[PDB]
Amino acid sequence: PVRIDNPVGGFSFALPAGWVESDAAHFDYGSALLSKTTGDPPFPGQPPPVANDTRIVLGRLDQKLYATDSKAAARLGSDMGEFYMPYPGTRINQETVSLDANGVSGSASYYEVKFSDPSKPNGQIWTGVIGSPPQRWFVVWLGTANNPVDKGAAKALAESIRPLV
Amino acid sequence: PVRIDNPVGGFSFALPAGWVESDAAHFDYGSALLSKTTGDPPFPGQPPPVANDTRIVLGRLDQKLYATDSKAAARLGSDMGEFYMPYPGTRINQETVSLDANGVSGSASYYEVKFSDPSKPNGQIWTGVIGSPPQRWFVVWLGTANNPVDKGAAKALAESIRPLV
Amino acid sequence: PVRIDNPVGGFSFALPAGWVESDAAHFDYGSALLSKTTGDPPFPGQPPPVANDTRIVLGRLDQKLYATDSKAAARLGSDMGEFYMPYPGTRINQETVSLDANGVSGSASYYEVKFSDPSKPNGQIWTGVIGSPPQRWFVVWLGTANNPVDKGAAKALAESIRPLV
Amino acid sequence: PVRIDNPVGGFSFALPAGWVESDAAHFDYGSALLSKTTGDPPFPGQPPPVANDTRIVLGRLDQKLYATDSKAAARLGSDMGEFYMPYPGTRINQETVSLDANGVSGSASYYEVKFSDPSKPNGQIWTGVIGSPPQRWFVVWLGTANNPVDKGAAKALAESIRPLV
Amino acid sequence: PVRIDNPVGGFSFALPAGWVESDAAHFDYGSALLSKTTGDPPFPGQPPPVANDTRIVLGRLDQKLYATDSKAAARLGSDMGEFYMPYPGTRINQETVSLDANGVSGSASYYEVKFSDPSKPNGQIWTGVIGSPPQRWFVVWLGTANNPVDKGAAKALAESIRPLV
Amino acid sequence: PVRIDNPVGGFSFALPAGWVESDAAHFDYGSALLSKTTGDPPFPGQPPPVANDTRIVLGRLDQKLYATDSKAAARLGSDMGEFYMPYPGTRINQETVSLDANGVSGSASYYEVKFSDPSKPNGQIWTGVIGSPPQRWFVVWLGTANNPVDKGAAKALAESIRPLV
């Protein structure tokens, strides 16, 4: 269990096994970007290869944005799907998941996308919003048929968030 | 008239007055990103402030992607609107524009977006696809009510593209 | 109250409300650069727009540099004004401010600059030096007539510094 | 045929089909780094995924370094193998190749490495040195059993180099 | 003679022997930053070590900034000295130099700085402004007692500037 | 005593006096790169000049890589010497050093390299591997005749590593 503090965003989280941070400037403004390592370990001290088709972004969800956590996660999930999967397609295999992060509750919206382009692998996106009983945080786990969202690990990641105090 | 070569993308273009390049790594793979300067000139040698709500991206449009140039620009324009304006809204003031870049023809799709969020300024996007009589290039000019797309300048930019030979 | 640790510089500080970190390489050598967010929140996970004409830099003040804290802040303030406002002008509205950071005392030097160029907004700079009773830290808050130095917040920032132990 | 100028290094070359530039700071000092695209095209304007286990570096070969071109390429090839494949192994399938770039001649040294680690794919490296009849340039193409050196394309790349005049 | 084009700035120049480019983002907005190599050549493909106390910056000099070229170079030289040598000192060994870049004339202002700090090496700065008979370009060569401005090479650099047409 | 946490790598260490961090992306994947400051302090807030010929890299040593700690450090030291000192030479002045980091033991391998090139300064490399009684970390301190490895400080750095819990 590797715990990571995000001081600007006011939270800590547990890094999922198999993932590293990428693009550390995210922390400057209270977010974090994670990538999934692939292949054999790199030379010591050098960055590991990471997958191209999956990513996790998490962070503080601005108070002015999105308004229950169920509605907020569904709305944020739709917006994230446009932002990261802009191509035409159809949503399938949708789910909503209740989140309970040590008392701070939330909700997540998951769906898969069958694209119009027959050559494109299906997309997958899990978007969670979790709050204290009013600071809020989001978790977005993006994947594909080839690197699927690990839904259990996405819930565990969101439920690992703790406010820094 | 400032002409800029993009060797990896196989084209040159005329830089619009008032714009500079940003994020030069775009050229590594045959694209270019431009930003609009704002304010007074910076100290000599230092980067100019640029606007936050408008941008131009242009580049070679991969042969496997998008299939007339009219259809290609409409499809690329829809995808670019999702990618850059992911929030819910309605398209208004749509236009299609014929392009003729020194014999190489093309088409552009323009639309404005009235967002559901009453506090968000309307979005604007112009997407052009232009080809030789089969290399193709795209031009996307993104703006808002506060920094509108200059449609004449967007057409001039797309019609300024020339293949490098 | 968001507290940020700067391990290389040996201090923590309270992030001012409305500010984020920029250019995280500053922390590699014991300094921090902050920028002021502007506009509506960005898309979640993306960096916020920041103001162009105001900035905060803080850090450990090297033992070989600058020698009371009153003299040190005045000298550092003059040097910072040259470095960040190199253009000809006149200092006006000067002030010196006593600092007391939980027992560790210091001083700050503030001044405004009326530039010779009538089209340039006046500049403003607040420079504080604070020490333990001999590690020392500096705080420089730069602004303009359009984004003024918040002198109360600058004093609060300097008086929020605590040594890491 | 996409020709790329490297002004600091004083040469141009033909970009191999299927490759893009990476890490453009190389050009600041007269070198170039290329990476091999993988997968489907990225969203227009965005960087393509590239392979992790193959790369090309080329550039001006400093006059003080390495001294026929046959000896120079063999020595540079040994050094490049240490730098990029530092792990213990055995060289196999060695070859030397004569180069003739429009009158400017040179030589290349190729070898494969069977590593001691049974789980590591074999390494492959092609190192060419080519000169005018005394400016010199190098080309290093690194690969593995999974992404082999394309020896014909490596020779074509080195023989595509032309001095800028 | 290595000629470098700066398309956004609308000029080309001759790279001084012994110098490389640094921080290529300068070209995005029409400027260039050069650094002086030190030591033995680096491993091929890797960046050369450069000196820490000398630099050249050149670029298009915005039409709204600075107004003969004699006055412009003196004013820009004073501002550049504040920006790059902010510490208290005295100017000594001042010179003004006429520039003639293939018909486009200009002027440069040089001075050395004896700092108040006895441990600081003297600073040196050469600032040139050159124009067509109304586009203008600047050249600033910064050095110290340990890496002096090469005044002949600075004049040659400014007189090497040619408009791109 | 400045202690630095590396959350992704699961350890903290004591920063050696005279060293700063460089290239902070190392922390994204559980490693750290340190550089040695040179010269007078930089302007406050600006990065210090660092030496070109010495560096420290440390990090978590992947469980699949390298298998006692004596053998692991010798093997990693050979690989690091190829990676960082690829040129032909002879090892001299070899040493092995036992490490005891607050109960977690390890070993280091040191050697100097006399290069074939008479103009190249001798190289020096110290490579340590230290473990809990099975997480492991490495420390590599690279130097030259002109900036030698400080062997006492390298041992102190490795023996300063503590797991984060």
Swiss-Prot record, chains A, B, C, D, E, F:
Q: Name one GO molecular function term.
A: extracellular matrix binding
The UniProt Biotechnology section states that this protein is used in the following way, namely: Major immunodominant antigen that has potential as a vaccine against tuberculosis. Can be used as a DNA vaccine in guinea pigs. Apa-ELISA could be used in diagnosis.
Give GO terms for biological process: cellular response to starvation
Q: What does this protein do?
A: A potent antigen in animals immunized with live bacteria, it induces a strong delayed-type hypersensitivity (DTH) in immunized animals. Elicits a mostly Th1 type of T-cell response in healthy humans; induces IFN-gamma production from CD4(+) and CD8(+) cells. Functions as an adhesin, binds to mouse macrophages via mannose residues. Might interact via host CD209.
Show the GO cellular component annotation of the record: cell surface; extracellular region
The entry sums up its family as follows: Belongs to the Apa family.
What fragment of the whole protein does this chain represent?
A: 110 to 287 of 325
What organism does the UniProt record list as the source? Mycobacterium tuberculosis (strain ATCC 25618 / H37Rv)
Principal place where this protein is found?
secreted
Identification of the protein by name: Alanine and proline-rich secreted protein Apa
Modification after translation (UniProt): Glycosylated, with mannose residues. The secreted protein has from 0 to 9 mannose residues, the majority have 6, 7, or 8 mannose residues (22, 24 and 17% respectively). Deglycosylated molecules had a significantly lower capacity to elicit a DTH reaction in guinea pigs in vivo or to activate specific T lymphocytes in vitro. Pretreating mouse macrophages with mannan decreases binding of M.tuberculosis. The non-glycosylated form stimulates IFN-gamma production however, so glycosylation is not essential. Runs as 45 and 47 kDa protein, the nature of the difference between the 2 forms is not known but is still seen after alpha-mannosidase treatment.
- Localized where? Secreted; Cell surface
- This protein's source sits in the domain of life called Bacteria
Kindly list the residue ranges recorded as spanning the membrane: none
